[PDB]
Amino acid sequence: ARTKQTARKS
């Protein structure tokens, strides 16, 4: 699962 906090560092 991808949260906006996780996908930050592209």
Added chain:
Amino acid sequence: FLYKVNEYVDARDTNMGAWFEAQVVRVTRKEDVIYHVKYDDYPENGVVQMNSRDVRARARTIIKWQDLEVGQVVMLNYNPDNPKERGFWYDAEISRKRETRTARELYANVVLGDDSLNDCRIIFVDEVFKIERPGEGSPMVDNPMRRKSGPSCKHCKDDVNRLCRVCACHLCGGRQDPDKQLMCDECDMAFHIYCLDPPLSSVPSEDEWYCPECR
């Protein structure tokens, strides 16, 4: 020795090879030491250990277009995935520059966390940073200004106080409790854990999560 505690520095993520704004918290030994740093706006990551190699003094000096010479290694902003957009901060050796009547064209070889990337069209020519070399210059002890990072949105203009549905929650528009802001693995839109008609109570351990619009 070199870097002191509380000193503001740049920490290079050995994975993507980018440099991030951080601050030294503790210094231990195994110039072969370990630097325990915390990222300014990455509290969810807490303290991180770094090799002396991946830590340098905080960038501060900007090299303007006129003083940019070819063959000069600097730190600039680039987005390997979306080159036309703003990305992160990498080291790069300026390969060539070409000024016409319409634009000053800056090209450099962006170094990444695995191998270089030759002849990249650098968008932000006014935001080029000189790498602080170990020794030269004073240590940054006072809280400095922030570099602009991460791709921008052309629908809210990255204005924190403005509610968006493209860069924020696709549903309501909020931007709080971001670690609960599910992102669909299809349209890359954000969906709060507590917003869609059966409010989820936790984070789907399943690798993927496809929103309602995409089933």
